[PDB]
Structure 1
Amino acid sequence: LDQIWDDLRAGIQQVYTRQSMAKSRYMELYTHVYNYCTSVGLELYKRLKEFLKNYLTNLLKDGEDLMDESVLKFYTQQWEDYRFSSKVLNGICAYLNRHWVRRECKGIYEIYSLALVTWRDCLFRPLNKQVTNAVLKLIEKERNGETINTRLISGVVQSYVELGLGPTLTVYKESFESQFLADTERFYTRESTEFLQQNPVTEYMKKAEARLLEEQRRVQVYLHESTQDELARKCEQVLIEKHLEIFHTEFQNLLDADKNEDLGRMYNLVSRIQDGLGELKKLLETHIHNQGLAAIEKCGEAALNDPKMYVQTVLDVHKKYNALVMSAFNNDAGFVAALDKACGRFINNNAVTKMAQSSSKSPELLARYCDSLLKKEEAELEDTLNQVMVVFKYIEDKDVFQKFYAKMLAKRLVHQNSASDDAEASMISKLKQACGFEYTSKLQRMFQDIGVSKDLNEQFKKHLTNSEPLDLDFSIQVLSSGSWPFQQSCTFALPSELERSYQRFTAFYASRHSGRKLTWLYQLSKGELVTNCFKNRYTLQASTFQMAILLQYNTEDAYTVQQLTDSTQIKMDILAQVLQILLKSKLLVLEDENANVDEVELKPDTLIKLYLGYKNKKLRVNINVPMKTEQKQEQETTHKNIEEDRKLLIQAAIVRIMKMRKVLKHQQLLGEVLTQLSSRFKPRVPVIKKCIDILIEKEYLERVDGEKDTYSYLA
């Protein structure tokens, strides 16, 4: 019992210094525990327990006064050793572990657990209030840029973990982690509030990103996995979210000034706080919105009559913040939403719509712009075209865009300044997809006729070859009255030099289509005139009307405004406007010389005389140009027209709806009406009411007696 306790202790002591052992000697000690056990299983124990307590206690003297990277170098170098030595002791003490108690009935032995336990009674000595501080100081060092030996920290923590009763973390937390994080909260709390007071936010953002990253390796490399998602939470907590109103106010400037790579960063940073990315979206919507209203504001009046300016301004706005939402805000749907909402808001209600007193001005402009683009290069057009379809998406009064687009496309197919039939087609393809089909088809019918009219002409061209030619080069366009916006008009005495082309064709068309009949549109038909009476002789493009007049100057030379309004039988209200062009052009002069003609009160009395001589330096002058008020008159008119169709469209809906419900309640119906009409426009409620009314008068609906605000369909 003591005959062994001595040599066994000899070995124990050798095993605890680090003197290599002999395979035989390891076993000798094993043997001693074997015999001491297979003879007391608490005597050998306590004696081992003593040897340990009276080993560590002594060791402590070697560090009691060590203090910085030294208790660290000390405590760790001592731990690594004590561990292995005990692993070996635990090895010899097999029989003390196993018979003397319970086995076979996990890396927990008691003899080793006996070693761990006594040492933690070495941990309370230096560590708790020291070896831990030395660590926090060293970590602080590395955080201030000081390259450090991380193994002085690893060793410590790994110890703590194991000195627990991997799963047990009390000691770790209680004697280190808790203080670690606390120190971290303050360290970063202090670094941030000081950097911000001394640096531009764009720079604090760069740093915070960095620190966060640094603190990552600072756990993966020398801390326990346990403290991972907490050091992270805490760091973001102090590095990112107590600085959100600072981040917020700056979010602005980072937009007020197009410095958008930082926006990406702020994004990636707030993208770390729960719901933190919310207020960013709000601020953006508001921003891009005001940003849009401003753009338009600064275009003043021009914008009101410059479609390119207008559409290009909106386009510029959107195109900026889109590619901005793509990179910077990682194409986040939540953000795409802000942009959309903002664009939808300003595109429909802005400075132009305001002064025009109607949101419908935007859609018309968009439509006009399209027209400009399709009149007489590729990348821009197909793209520009494509951008147009983007804007459209946001327009709410879409029927308006549609009416104008057709109204203007039509004035094109006929007369002039249409680009390649390609863009034209390509733009149809684009509408086929956004716009409906009833719409797309309506347009198709227009193209059909033009083609049909084309072939029709090639027929007549022959009919003339096959007989008596005409006194001029004639061509016509027969358009189905129903499919075109055109309206015949201004009464008109047709000059003689044409009458042959007229009858000659009329007869022909009548021979081609028996059941049909033609109604000629002079306000929309032109021709080429030749001048064999001036210094130089030229060909001038001229509206029929203009020709109807000029041709009169083939007899006398002056004609009172009345002498004309009588002859050509072309209307004064309008006949006057034409003359003004003819004057400003310079083929007519009133009487006097000074030309304040641009703004005169040409009364019936006033004379209009042919001017002989001088003329355009060129040989082909196009005297046919828009009467000024002409456009403003067509515009206001097509709107007026849209006002009508709207009510008619509304009722159509009211009906088919009440026709497939037999009874509905006021609201019920209004909701329906909207749902359908939504893709085209937003029927003002008072109007659907004034509509449901007229249907009651037209006897398509009747109120449900014994139930006001409920309607029944009257078959």
Structure 2
Amino acid sequence: QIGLDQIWDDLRAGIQQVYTRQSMAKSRYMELYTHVYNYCTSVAQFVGLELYKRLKEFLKNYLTNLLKDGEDLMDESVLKFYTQQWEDYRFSSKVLNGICAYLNRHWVRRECDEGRKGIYEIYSLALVTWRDCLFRPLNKQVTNAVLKLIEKERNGETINTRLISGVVQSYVELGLNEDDAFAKGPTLTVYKESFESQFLADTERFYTRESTEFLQQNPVTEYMKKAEARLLEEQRRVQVYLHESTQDELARKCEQVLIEKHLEIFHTEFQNLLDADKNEDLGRMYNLVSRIQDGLGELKKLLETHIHNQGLAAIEKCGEAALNDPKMYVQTVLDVHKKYNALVMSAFNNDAGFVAALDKACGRFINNNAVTKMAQSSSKSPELLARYCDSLLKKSSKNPEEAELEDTLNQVMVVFKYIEDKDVFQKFYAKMLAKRLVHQNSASDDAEASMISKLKQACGFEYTSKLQRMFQDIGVSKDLNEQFKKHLTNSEPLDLDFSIQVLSSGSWPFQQSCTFALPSELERSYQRFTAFYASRHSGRKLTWLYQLSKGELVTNCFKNRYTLQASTFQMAILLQYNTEDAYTVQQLTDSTQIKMDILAQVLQILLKSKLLVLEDENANVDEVELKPDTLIKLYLGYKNKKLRVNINVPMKTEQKQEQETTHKNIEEDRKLLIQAAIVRIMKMRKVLKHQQLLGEVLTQLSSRFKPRVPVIKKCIDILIEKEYLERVDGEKDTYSY
């Protein structure tokens, strides 16, 4: 056994040799370890408390004596002193924890389990003694010095990262809770109590100073660059000389000071930068404001208002010319969408909220713009879209390239997605598809198939079921034409060539033709085809409208031969001219049974082309109001440069008539569909408030056509007069089925 006073002199000399680091040898280390070991194993029966008391007193005395050399120092000098003394103290205490390791494992561990909190591991005793003799009196000075060094580093200068990293490492390690040194993770109790709080409350002051000293004398365009640089720079000073847990708090505080405090100046510059379309700075501003959660809400409103206003200005620039030129209008809307879609996809990083604001902006724009207000109806926009879509697929002189045509039809479908009243587009496209398919005016059938498939992908199947039935009816009619040609070759033939395209009455929206006198050869051809038709499949009927059928006649009575193609009405009138030349309008009406208006327009076209003369050529030709007593005489001296000249060109007064007939038909279709929808709704509901009922109808039909409240009141009046949707007894609010 060895008493403490017999060994404490040598042990104290050795520990003082450790702290005043003079490059000790391992022999002295093992002599010191034997000195601790030979005392802790000698004979309230566990020796080692006295040695712990002398170690605590020695470390307290050493740190109190060390403090007197650093209390007067300030700024860089006290920080250098603290970091050098902390590194030396930490290393020499890590040595002392190995010297007094036996007391660290078999008395400190023994007396820390049995309560007795207040005695710690010798290393953790050295940190606690550091936390009470050289950290508390040098806390404010050192943290002020490192704050000033951070100020000098932020101001643009270069400063030592080693000193700051040493101070921050000391502040992190000093946070070791003494009561349970066997803790989990790194302890930051001291760190976020004397430095992180002070540094994080001083960075607020320094960035509010840079903000309202740079934003005052520089535009916001440069301030965004400076703010992005500062945010990256404080992402840098968490990994250089700070702790990794200050990253989130520091980035959040820098965002709240640089951005959130001055978000009121970003919005007033958002419109200015959007007007000049500086896409790079828009991307920089979105990348800056997006860090502020819930602050992006005002940017979407400004963006959608600007997109709507810019589109409205573009459509106003189109003016009256866009009404009669569908390509210009659709190209203007498409160009606005293309310009303000890259700005959302590239600058705004294709954000869901921003692309939703773009979609909502054009929805209020394509349906209701200057050209629609000029036509006092929102149906002019999908009608113009349908006209443009018909113009691309029409057989022009220059056929469009198939890849180019597919791309521009996809662009049209992109425009179509924002059309509110898709029903008007459906009806107009159906009629244009009819007028193209019955005349073989389609540029390419695969283009039509692709458009039908894209419409199918866009809006259900009932939207384009009629169109698909029309296309398959065209195919079936082609097969039937081939079969009738084979039958004509087999059976008795017709001198007149015959080529029909039989179409379903359910599809192909058309108008039933007026009464018509069938020519004798045409009567024979009609009877032959009906015989073949009954031979194939009999139990049905055919309407035989001659409004959209043509053919060419040989003018042998003329001075020169002609192969002039003419409509069936015009074919009958020319046959009547062949039978007798002198012929009156009243005779035309009573023999050909054609209605007077359409027959008058036919005669107007015939006089317009100078196909044959009237009873007086010197009278009005293109502006004559023909009367039943007007006589028309065959003119054999008609001259033209070509023989296959077309007289079946459309007349100017019928395009608008078909347009308004389409509007009436789609209005009746709207009425029928909303009647059926409200019937289903009241079948599933059986009682509902009036405004709730109209809201339910609007939400139920919103996927295909947004209804109008006066039309809803008209159809509900029709149904309440029809007892299908009758009123319940004595109520003005609700009713029952």
Matched residues in 2 for 1:163 and 1:256: separation?
A: 56
> How far off is 1:598 after superposition?
5.9
Matched residue SS, 1:493: coil
Residues 1:41 and 1:495: Cα distance change in structure 2 (over 3 Å):
closer
Matched residues in 2 for 1:329 and 1:153: separation?
A: 38
Q: Say if 2:67 and 2:134, in contact at 8 Å, map to a contact too.
A: no
CA-to-aligned-CA distance 1:650-683 (integer Å, 9 cap, x gap)? 4344445556666666567556544554433334
CA-to-aligned-CA distance 1:405-461 (integer Å, 9 cap, x gap)? 222222222124112222222222233333444454433443344334333333443
Farther-moved stretch of structure 1 (185-194 vs 318-327):
318-327
Matched residues in 2 for 1:58 and 1:246: separation?
A: 56
CA-to-aligned-CA distance 1:249-277 (integer Å, 9 cap, x gap)? 23323432333343333223222112122
CA-to-aligned-CA distance 1:328-353 (integer Å, 9 cap, x gap)? 33333323321222222222222222
> How far off is 1:213 after superposition?
2.2
CA-to-aligned-CA distance 1:216-262 (integer Å, 9 cap, x gap)? 23122211234232111111111221221222223323432333343
Residues 1:67 and 1:540: Cα distance change in structure 2 (over 3 Å):
farther
CA-to-aligned-CA distance 1:476-520 (integer Å, 9 cap, x gap)? 233344433222334444556644434444555455555444433
Residues 1:668 and 1:178: Cα distance change in structure 2 (over 3 Å):
closer
Q: Say if 2:613 and 2:632, in contact at 8 Å, map to a contact too.
A: yes
Matched residues in 2 for 1:231 and 1:452: separation?
A: 74
Q: Say if 1:495 and 1:568, in contact at 8 Å, map to a contact too.
A: no
CA-to-aligned-CA distance 1:281-310 (integer Å, 9 cap, x gap)? 222232322233333222222222333233
Q: Say if 1:453 and 1:476, in contact at 8 Å, map to a contact too.
A: yes
Residues 1:668 and 1:136: Cα distance change in structure 2 (over 3 Å):
closer
Identity %: 100
> How far off is 1:168 after superposition?
5.1
Farther-moved stretch of structure 1 (628-637 vs 461-470):
461-470
Matched residues in 2 for 1:611 and 1:710: separation?
A: 72
Matched residue SS, 1:608: strand
Residues 1:324 and 1:508: Cα distance change in structure 2 (over 3 Å):
same
> How far off is 1:60 after superposition?
5.4
Residues 1:9 and 1:658: Cα distance change in structure 2 (over 3 Å):
closer
Residues 1:169 and 1:123: Cα distance change in structure 2 (over 3 Å):
farther
Residues 1:87 and 1:647: Cα distance change in structure 2 (over 3 Å):
closer
Residues 1:64 and 1:671: Cα distance change in structure 2 (over 3 Å):
closer
TM-score where L is the length of structure 2? 0.83
Matched residue SS, 1:103: helix
Residues 1:375 and 1:220: Cα distance change in structure 2 (over 3 Å):
same
Q: Say if 2:554 and 2:563, in contact at 8 Å, map to a contact too.
A: yes
**Which residue in the other structure is 2:164 paired with?**
153
CA-to-aligned-CA distance 1:537-579 (integer Å, 9 cap, x gap)? 5433322233444556658888777776677564442334334
> How far off is 1:108 after superposition?
7.5
> How far off is 1:617 after superposition?
4.3
> How far off is 1:367 after superposition?
2.4
Residues 1:672 and 1:63: Cα distance change in structure 2 (over 3 Å):
closer
Farther-moved stretch of structure 1 (401-410 vs 320-329):
320-329
For structure 2, the 5+ residue unaligned runs are: 177-184, 396-400
> How far off is 1:155 after superposition?
0.9
Residues 1:69 and 1:706: Cα distance change in structure 2 (over 3 Å):
closer
Matched residue SS, 2:649: coil
Aligned CA RMSD, in angstroms, stands at 4.0
> How far off is 1:593 after superposition?
9.1
Farther-moved stretch of structure 1 (386-395 vs 402-411):
386-395
> How far off is 1:69 after superposition?
4.5
Matched residue SS, 1:84: helix
Q: Say if 1:364 and 1:400, in contact at 8 Å, map to a contact too.
A: yes
Q: Say if 2:15 and 2:96, in contact at 8 Å, map to a contact too.
A: yes
Q: Say if 1:674 and 1:682, in contact at 8 Å, map to a contact too.
A: yes
Matched residues in 1 for 2:534 and 2:93: separation?
A: 119
Matched residue SS, 1:703: coil
Residues 1:299 and 1:108: Cα distance change in structure 2 (over 3 Å):
farther
Farther-moved stretch of structure 1 (83-92 vs 563-572):
563-572
Residues 1:81 and 1:698: Cα distance change in structure 2 (over 3 Å):
closer
Matched residues in 2 for 1:404 and 1:438: separation?
A: 16
Residues 1:513 and 1:97: Cα distance change in structure 2 (over 3 Å):
closer
CA-to-aligned-CA distance 1:168-200 (integer Å, 9 cap, x gap)? 545434443233223311222222333334444
Residues 1:540 and 1:108: Cα distance change in structure 2 (over 3 Å):
farther
Residues 1:481 and 1:75: Cα distance change in structure 2 (over 3 Å):
closer
Residues 1:107 and 1:506: Cα distance change in structure 2 (over 3 Å):
farther
Q: Say if 1:353 and 1:362, in contact at 8 Å, map to a contact too.
A: yes
Q: Say if 2:108 and 2:119, in contact at 8 Å, map to a contact too.
A: no
Residues 1:53 and 1:429: Cα distance change in structure 2 (over 3 Å):
closer
> How far off is 1:638 after superposition?
1.5
Residues 1:496 and 1:157: Cα distance change in structure 2 (over 3 Å):
same
Matched residue SS, 1:620: coil
Matched residues in 2 for 1:615 and 1:149: separation?
A: 102
Q: Say if 1:90 and 1:109, in contact at 8 Å, map to a contact too.
A: no
Matched residues in 2 for 1:712 and 1:115: separation?
A: 87
Matched residue SS, 1:550: helix
- Of 21, 26, 30 in structure 1, the residue corresponding to residue 24 of structure 2 is 21
Matched residue SS, 1:228: helix
Residues 1:462 and 1:274: Cα distance change in structure 2 (over 3 Å):
closer
**Which residue in the other structure is 1:94 paired with?**
101
Farther-moved stretch of structure 1 (381-390 vs 212-221):
381-390
Residues 1:252 and 1:538: Cα distance change in structure 2 (over 3 Å):
farther
- Of 140, 150, 164 in structure 1, the residue corresponding to residue 151 of structure 2 is 140
> How far off is 1:636 after superposition?
0.4
Matched residue SS, 1:334: helix
Farther-moved stretch of structure 1 (45-54 vs 540-549):
45-54
Residues 1:640 and 1:94: Cα distance change in structure 2 (over 3 Å):
closer
> How far off is 1:525 after superposition?
1.0
> How far off is 1:611 after superposition?
6.8
Matched residue SS, 1:203: helix
Residues 1:155 and 1:506: Cα distance change in structure 2 (over 3 Å):
closer
Q: Say if 1:236 and 1:273, in contact at 8 Å, map to a contact too.
A: yes
> How far off is 1:632 after superposition?
0.3
Residues 1:675 and 1:620: Cα distance change in structure 2 (over 3 Å):
same
> How far off is 1:67 after superposition?
5.6
Residues 1:25 and 1:674: Cα distance change in structure 2 (over 3 Å):
closer
Matched residues in 1 for 2:684 and 2:71: separation?
A: 95
Residues 1:268 and 1:598: Cα distance change in structure 2 (over 3 Å):
farther
Q: Say if 1:703 and 1:709, in contact at 8 Å, map to a contact too.
A: no
Farther-moved stretch of structure 1 (49-58 vs 381-390):
49-58
Matched residues in 2 for 1:94 and 1:152: separation?
A: 31
Residues 1:503 and 1:52: Cα distance change in structure 2 (over 3 Å):
closer
Matched residues in 2 for 1:136 and 1:10: separation?
A: 39
Matched residue SS, 1:199: coil
1:313-324 equivalent positions in 2, closer than 5 A: 313-324=332-343
Q: Say if 1:325 and 1:332, in contact at 8 Å, map to a contact too.
A: yes
Q: What is the number of equivalent residue pairs in this alignment? A: 713
Matched residues in 2 for 1:616 and 1:198: separation?
A: 79
Residues 1:144 and 1:658: Cα distance change in structure 2 (over 3 Å):
closer
Residues 1:445 and 1:49: Cα distance change in structure 2 (over 3 Å):
closer
Q: Say if 1:288 and 1:342, in contact at 8 Å, map to a contact too.
A: yes
Farther-moved stretch of structure 1 (501-510 vs 368-377):
501-510
Matched, 1:581 2:581: no
Residues 1:155 and 1:578: Cα distance change in structure 2 (over 3 Å):
same
